[PDB]
Protein backbone atom coordinates (compact mmCIF):
# COMPACT_ATOMS: atom_id res chain seq x y z
CA UNK A 1 0.00 0.00 0.00
CA UNK A 2 2.67 2.49 0.97
CA UNK A 3 5.67 2.10 -1.27
CA UNK A 4 4.01 1.98 -4.68
CA UNK A 5 0.77 3.08 -6.34
CA UNK A 6 -2.57 1.34 -5.74
CA UNK A 7 -3.81 1.66 -9.34
CA UNK A 8 -0.69 -0.15 -10.45
CA UNK A 9 0.60 -2.03 -7.41
CA UNK A 10 -2.52 -4.16 -7.10
CA UNK A 11 -0.54 -6.48 -9.37
CA UNK A 12 1.87 -6.72 -6.45
CA UNK A 13 -1.15 -7.74 -4.39
CA UNK A 14 -2.43 -9.91 -7.19
CA UNK A 15 0.27 -12.55 -7.10
CA UNK A 16 0.56 -12.39 -3.33
CA UNK A 17 -2.96 -13.74 -2.99
CA UNK A 18 -2.56 -17.01 -4.70
CA UNK A 19 0.31 -18.72 -2.92
CA UNK A 20 -1.38 -17.91 0.34
CA UNK A 21 -4.48 -19.40 -1.23
CA UNK A 22 -2.30 -22.33 -2.24
CA UNK A 23 -0.85 -22.75 1.22
CA UNK A 24 -4.36 -22.78 2.64
CA UNK A 25 -5.26 -25.19 -0.17
CA UNK A 26 -2.48 -27.52 0.90
CA UNK A 27 -3.33 -27.26 4.57
CA UNK A 28 -6.95 -28.21 4.04
CA UNK A 29 -5.68 -31.00 1.81
CA UNK A 30 -2.94 -32.45 3.96
CA UNK A 31 -5.21 -32.33 6.99
CA UNK A 32 -8.01 -34.08 5.09
CA UNK A 33 -5.87 -37.05 4.18
CA UNK A 34 -4.94 -37.62 7.80
CA UNK A 35 -8.39 -36.51 8.96
CA UNK A 36 -10.57 -39.41 7.92
CA UNK A 37 -7.52 -41.61 8.28
CA UNK A 38 -8.09 -41.11 12.01
CA UNK A 39 -11.73 -42.18 11.73
CA UNK A 40 -10.60 -45.19 9.72
CA UNK A 41 -8.41 -45.92 12.69
CA UNK A 42 -11.16 -44.89 15.08
CA UNK A 43 -13.83 -47.20 13.72
CA UNK A 44 -11.40 -49.96 14.53
CA UNK A 45 -11.02 -48.36 17.94
CA UNK A 46 -14.73 -48.26 18.68
CA UNK A 47 -15.17 -51.81 17.46
CA UNK A 48 -12.65 -53.07 19.99
CA UNK A 49 -14.55 -50.93 22.46
CA UNK B 1 -23.72 -15.54 -1.15
CA UNK B 2 -22.16 -12.30 -2.46
CA UNK B 3 -21.28 -8.96 -0.88
CA UNK B 4 -23.76 -6.14 -1.46
CA UNK B 5 -25.02 -3.29 0.74
CA UNK B 6 -28.53 -4.59 1.53
CA UNK B 7 -31.02 -2.86 3.86
CA UNK B 8 -31.34 -4.45 7.34
CA UNK B 9 -34.27 -6.71 8.12
CA UNK B 10 -36.88 -4.26 9.40
CA UNK B 11 -34.31 -1.47 9.18
CA UNK B 12 -34.41 1.54 11.47
CA UNK B 13 -35.41 4.32 9.10
CA UNK B 14 -36.82 7.80 9.62
CA UNK B 15 -40.48 8.77 9.45
CA UNK B 16 -40.76 11.92 7.33
CA UNK B 17 -43.85 13.48 5.81
CA UNK B 18 -45.29 15.87 3.28
CA UNK B 19 -48.71 16.07 4.89
CA UNK B 20 -51.06 19.03 4.60
CA UNK B 21 -53.92 17.48 2.53
CA UNK B 22 -51.92 20.79 8.90
CA UNK B 23 -48.57 22.61 8.56
CA UNK B 24 -46.02 19.83 8.09
CA UNK B 25 -43.64 20.38 5.15
CA UNK B 26 -40.37 18.43 4.99
CA UNK B 27 -37.55 18.36 2.42
CA UNK B 28 -34.10 18.20 4.06
CA UNK B 29 -30.57 17.92 2.66
CA UNK B 30 -29.74 14.35 3.34
CA UNK B 31 -26.40 12.49 3.29
CA UNK B 32 -25.13 9.79 0.96
CA UNK B 33 -24.25 6.61 2.93
CA UNK B 34 -23.54 2.95 2.03
CA UNK B 35 -26.23 2.60 -0.60
CA UNK B 36 -29.36 4.73 -0.30
CA UNK B 37 -32.82 3.31 0.36
CA UNK B 38 -35.18 6.01 -0.94
CA UNK B 39 -38.90 5.58 -1.59
CA UNK B 40 -41.33 8.24 -2.80
CA UNK B 41 -44.80 7.15 -1.67
CA UNK B 42 -47.74 9.25 -2.83
CA UNK B 43 -51.28 9.08 -4.01
CA UNK B 44 -51.51 12.49 -5.62
Amino acid sequence: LSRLDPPEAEVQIDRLITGRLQSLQTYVTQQLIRAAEIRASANLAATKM
Amino acid sequence: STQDLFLPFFSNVTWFHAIHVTKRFDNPVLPFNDGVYFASTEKS
Partner: protein, 46 residues
Protein backbone atom coordinates in the same frame (compact mmCIF):
# COMPACT_ATOMS: atom_id res chain seq x y z
CA UNK C 1 -45.63 -60.27 8.45
CA UNK C 2 -44.35 -57.69 11.00
CA UNK C 3 -41.56 -56.52 8.69
CA UNK C 4 -43.42 -56.40 5.37
CA UNK C 5 -45.31 -53.19 6.15
CA UNK C 6 -42.46 -51.20 7.68
CA UNK C 7 -40.39 -52.18 4.64
CA UNK C 8 -43.05 -50.59 2.41
CA UNK C 9 -42.18 -46.90 2.02
CA UNK C 10 -32.65 -42.36 6.66
CA UNK C 11 -31.58 -46.03 6.38
CA UNK C 12 -28.67 -48.38 7.21
CA UNK C 13 -25.67 -47.44 5.03
CA UNK C 14 -27.43 -46.27 1.84
CA UNK C 15 -28.68 -42.79 2.85
CA UNK C 16 -25.14 -41.56 3.28
CA UNK C 17 -23.35 -40.66 0.04
CA UNK C 18 -26.17 -39.32 -2.13
CA UNK C 19 -26.63 -36.60 0.42
CA UNK C 20 -23.02 -35.69 -0.13
CA UNK C 21 -22.37 -36.17 -3.84
CA UNK C 22 -25.46 -34.01 -4.16
CA UNK C 23 -23.64 -31.63 -1.85
CA UNK C 24 -20.36 -32.02 -3.71
CA UNK C 25 -21.47 -32.04 -7.33
CA UNK C 26 -22.82 -28.63 -6.64
CA UNK C 27 -19.28 -27.78 -5.72
CA UNK C 28 -17.56 -28.67 -9.01
CA UNK C 29 -19.48 -25.87 -10.72
CA UNK C 30 -18.11 -23.59 -8.07
CA UNK C 31 -14.46 -24.52 -7.24
CA UNK C 32 -12.76 -22.83 -10.18
CA UNK C 33 -15.56 -20.36 -10.82
CA UNK C 34 -14.28 -19.25 -7.38
CA UNK C 35 -11.28 -17.05 -6.59
CA UNK C 36 -7.70 -18.07 -7.64
CA UNK C 37 -6.74 -14.44 -6.87
CA UNK C 38 -6.02 -13.23 -10.44
CA UNK C 39 -7.72 -10.37 -12.34
CA UNK C 40 -10.26 -12.93 -13.56
CA UNK C 41 -10.91 -16.54 -12.67
CA UNK C 42 -10.48 -18.11 -16.20
CA UNK C 43 -6.94 -18.41 -17.50
CA UNK C 44 -7.09 -16.98 -21.05
CA UNK C 45 -7.82 -13.44 -19.85
CA UNK C 46 -4.60 -13.84 -17.88
Amino acid sequence: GKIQDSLSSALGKLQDVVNQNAQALNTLVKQLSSNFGAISSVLNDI
